[model samples]
Target: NSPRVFCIGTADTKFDELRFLSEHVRSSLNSFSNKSSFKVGVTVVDVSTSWKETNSCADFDFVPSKDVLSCHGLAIAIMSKALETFLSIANDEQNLAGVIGLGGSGGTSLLSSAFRSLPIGIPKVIISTVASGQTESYIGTSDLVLFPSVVDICGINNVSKVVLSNAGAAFAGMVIGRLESNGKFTVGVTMFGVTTPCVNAVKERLVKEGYETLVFHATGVGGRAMEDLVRGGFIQGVLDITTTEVADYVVGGVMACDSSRFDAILEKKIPLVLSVGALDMVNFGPKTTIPPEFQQRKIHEHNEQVSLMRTTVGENKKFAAFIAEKLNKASSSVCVCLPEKGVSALDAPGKDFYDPEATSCLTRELQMLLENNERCQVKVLPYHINDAEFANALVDSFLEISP
Candidate 1:
């Protein structure tokens, strides 16, 4: 039996074009599989909203926009139905090999949502007239490949045929040779420049014990990427050693992570060991970018392009409250470890950002906000965050809760 590469589009408008692409995909994949010992199949999906039956080439039809609007309202019900249908097919392990979609702006938005619903490693491609423009919204945090269609997807002309045929062959080759991971249990770890030593120690320990550790920088995008992997089910547990992006978010820094930072771990109920690593400083651009009102605040220039701003007592209190609010809401096992000595390299006693009052403010607020329950606990360790003892303690705490 051949594993299927789903071709998704608005069949009401692009029926002939989609049919041509499907035929080419089937032929090319068959030829490739004959030489490579792996077979690929084609499944055309119709996502038309106008309630029109597509050409006979479509193998599956789902989420009639007419019915969805009638039942759930026109706001998000149509998209919700389309995503549900795509998920239903994607979840079947034996049926799906890859996914490809052809569309303009509307079709791109619709089918890309379906493509993003699939997990990280699946082969996903979108050939769209809008591909040459800003696609951050369309490809947000997913590994979907966007191929620009030089001509519109209205009809199968010479340019359209060339692009579609090449895209078909590309998708076939990708699925026929997708990489499979080794059976190691994957763990996600957050890190920053100041927290690298501690995270390295933890990662070394975990890797020695036969677990694969994925380290994500605590920069805004890096933290978001780690959370996306967690949501995609690629990561089993998290060692959130450097929750520094929270500082950026609270202080309006350049590296501010989105509000949904810890949401995936909370929803998944996964084992998590968190810390206040690098929470002492807020990230900004060049010193000139600093706002005029706060020029007197403690600042350090890490490099030509990056500046660090020390957190104040008030900001620390708010940050602690923010961290505790999310942790308190978690239904999963959580161990929040605090380093009483210092939170980051710059926060140590002789450093530029040393502020005991600020650190104390955060620590006291977190302790006051969190309750030590069966599934959640807090520990205050008397060591600098980069100290070997503190790193070992983090590993031990993670082992206790990890599955």
Candidate 2:
């Protein structure tokens, strides 16, 4: 009878403010639902790492303590785990209409990480002081609404009350309206500029296969977003064609994806097809952003904003090893396609980054490292990465893995 909502916050840092917000949320939901003939309920979720040893907000009775650790960067990882555990319990018995959270930098980071994992149309919203700033990292490509808390969340005031009340009402309205919506299955693919052609081909094939494809550009945040979708189960599979971020990670490029790349696929064991897409070069911002340490190293200005640094043979060796180690952990089906002739349009023989020896290092290392895995095999093709032959080979690899 009640539209259930999950409210999360770090009780230690924002207990009083959150407590008030929770009460207001209940009132707002009730008032809105009264008109729509739908009842609303609120449940408080906590991300206090200090309470990790204690467990459960009710266990500690939602009391605030000074020693509680904020777990800033780690908040995303911990909150995600907590939400998964809580959601499982809810699904086994109770139902949820939506989720809402309140926090500052730490709270926003932690809560948004967990909320983004929720299914679409579940009405996830966050009220935070940092919401008004550029939130490309927090919102990513998801549909999360960020409400600006004009005042700090440390205490309640005239400004805080108004902001929190409005956010709760908005959340209630959103949840009530979306409860009648339908859900669909979607697959996400990871791509970069050089790998777009291959991803385009995969997207078309997936559409024909009765799947909607969402492509993530595989920049730092983009890789994380695609991984989030995989974990959310919104994406049934991943067409991870632009693993080039690994090159960036090794060569110290600015766009380097975190070491967490490819982690979600392994953890979720999703049906995934991967490739050495655009791995030939480590990417940096404009040529000016190139580190002084390697300014003389082979650098090509792709555009005013993008600087391409060719990967060395040694770096490719390490990159291949890294890729193989991660792929070996996937319990589900996977394949890694290597374009021997070129890994990207910018990696052809005449191209600035075209170094057969470096490509050979990647090829030989992957072949050697992945030899033990039967589920993940290495396929070498003699065409450029964007060529029809290379793209079809990738399609074939996907079919082979799935079939």
Candidate 3:
């Protein structure tokens, strides 16, 4: 089976650069020598409106961008959406092994739109002039790699040829490496703004222990995607420190995962160390948008746009039962590490959401529901959730039952 590395870019504006990149990729793949019979192919997809037959099909091959939506928004924005949709469908049908793209601001922005949706661990590299600066906007949570082009991409001159050759080599190497799973114990760890300290502490220990940590934010979508990746078998263990999404789910909040939060872990049988990180608060857009029912409750304005509401006694009981029921079905190792004093930075004594009674309610309910469970064990620690001692307990518990 031949795996094709789809090269995406605007050929009309940067024809020579795109073609040169494609040629280099094909040569790199053709020359790649592994111990087994493995080969790679290249397909250049043109995202330009001026793609007129490409002179001749035999000489130049490109999947036209017109074959692909819009806002009266920026023209570039419209093109990016089109490219993203096309690649998503194309990758689903044939399953692209890797994707290599070349561009400046518009091209880089356009290519990254599609890159974000592609599955994690797939080799996706972008050679861009705009790669040197803050790329968090382009990269987000995906594993797409950015290769900086030292010189601008107009023609395949001396500088571009050298840069693109190395890019080809790197992209090809990544594709080959994808054939062999990155021989590391990749663990998925969930985190939130309030729980960063604890998650960071656990992450550092895991690093020294030679484990690759894929840290995810526990926003509503973050919780869902992390579990989805686990079901795909990309994750080995989960350090679910910030299940804030569940807090939002129980109460009507913006950053909320659905009822099927922990279902994947039940089916996957992976080791999971759970905690009530940020369980005290339900997220909302702003203090102004706090629901009519919660107006009587104490609300913390995290920022101008971010507001948080404290969970009540009844909500904590439901949160506990909901979480415990999922863990109870787990056929693999699970440790529920409950911090005695607080669940998040703001939940500590004298803090905004500091309510010992509510915290205890969640703890007691979970301890009761998880009572007599063999596979899943509840460990109540005496420190705050962000304490080094508490963070250490999470890593230790994971290692204690981890495969």
Candidate 4:
């Protein structure tokens, strides 16, 4: 069998380095494949320039600056598109064995975007100059291997040569690793401070049912991490109890998972149980940074550094549409639970974010848009979101769908 490997970078900025890495990969794979009876092909993704610039068969013009999406984001976008296209046309003998990318700060950002896009278990590695520093964004929740390039990738001399060679060899070894190991089926669960109990309940139930569970906090990166796993097939289902990140995305908040959040679950048509656990509040830091638009709104100081804002009736309507739009696209079984008493702890009567009108608006808006169907049903719970009854209901609904 042969595996397709990707070697991507900004040709304009690191053409020589990418070329050297690709050559090394070809040589290394040729040696290994000859002994193991495997074949390998390398594709170069050039994000530094466009089609007008590279005009080569394997070379791609990854345009990142065309939108605020940024060059780095674009590099990831194009690389993913190219991989998908290649995989679709590739013959049965051509397996998508692995992907390796190279870059400095910008190149790393761009290439990693694409690298993270490929489904998990397909060997992926990135050789980055910034690997020695923090790489939360580049690596995210996936299992991508990041190798630190001690020297700049301007040209392959002594140190650069070693870095690139190791990266190539590691990818070859990764393919072998995949061949030997069996990856477990993973499911993602989303939770926030208010919905932690419900998520825990679901996780315990799933574990007992012989399914692995991953819980992500409903912050910006947290929701994205869950969505990434869903897209990568590392997640079989989602227990999205705390969609509070959608609130941050709707209202002006410090944390916001992009609009594409939850899109993967819909596209995958997986078993997803949704809720309005923390939709009553907009999260923020301390008391000061609240936007001028929300200056007059009701605010509550949760802690010295954390402040909470009650969602207005108007904002809840918009938030409902955002949630419904994503949920309605699910072709597979889905359920949306509503907590009639309160969505979060701070949302109870007389609490800081307590506003029954806001909750009612969300309820009515969601009910109005959700076309009644058997596959997608809506249930209203009379208990508070944290109540044991509510938690059990969530797990029950998840089992009903997944089982």
Per residue, candidate 1 scores C-alpha lDDT tens digits across 1-403 of: 5467777777778878888788887777777663455556577766676647644564533334343334323523476465546555555656578888788888777777777767788888888999999997788778999889998887889899899999988887787766222487899999998887899999999999788989988888888888889898888999999988999998888888888879889898888999998989999869888888789988999998999999988998888877887888888899988888789988998988888777776777787788655566888877788898999999999999987
356: Cα error in model 4, Å? 2.6
- Tens digit of per-residue lDDT, candidate 3, span 255-358: 88889999987788888999999899998867667778768887888788888888988998889987998888888788999998999899999988898898
Candidate 2 residue 332 C-alpha distance from true site, Å: 2.7
Candidate 3: lDDT of 250? Answer: 78
Q: What is candidate 2's lDDT per residue for 48-106, written digit by digit as tens?
A: 66643323443223322222232225645765556655654554454678778888887
Task: Rank candidates, lDDT, best first.
Answer: 3, 1, 2, 4
User: Which candidate wins on TM-score?
Assistant: 1
Candidates, ranked, TM-score: 1, 4, 2, 3
> Comparing 1 and 3 by lDDT, which wins?
3
Best candidate, lDDT-wise? 3
CA lDDT for candidate 2: 0.75
> Model 2, stretches more than 4 Å misplaced?
1-3, 6-20, 34-38, 44-97, 104-122, 140-143, 151-162, 180-185
RMSD to the hidden true structure, all candidates = 3.8, 4.9, 6.7, 5.1
The predicted structure with the larger lDDT, 1 or 4, is 1
lDDT of 4 by residue, 1-403 (tens): 5556767666666667877788777677766653455456676765553543543423332323222123225545565455444433432345767777787887677666666666767777888889998899788877788899998877879888888888888876676555444276677877887677677777887788788988888778888878877776668888888887888888877777688977878888888888887988788877767777777888878788888887888988989888888777778898888887788888877667777777877877887788665577888777778777887888778778985
3 or 4, greater by TM-score:
4
- In order, candidate lDDTs are 0.80, 0.75, 0.82, 0.74
TM-score of each: 0.84, 0.80, 0.62, 0.81
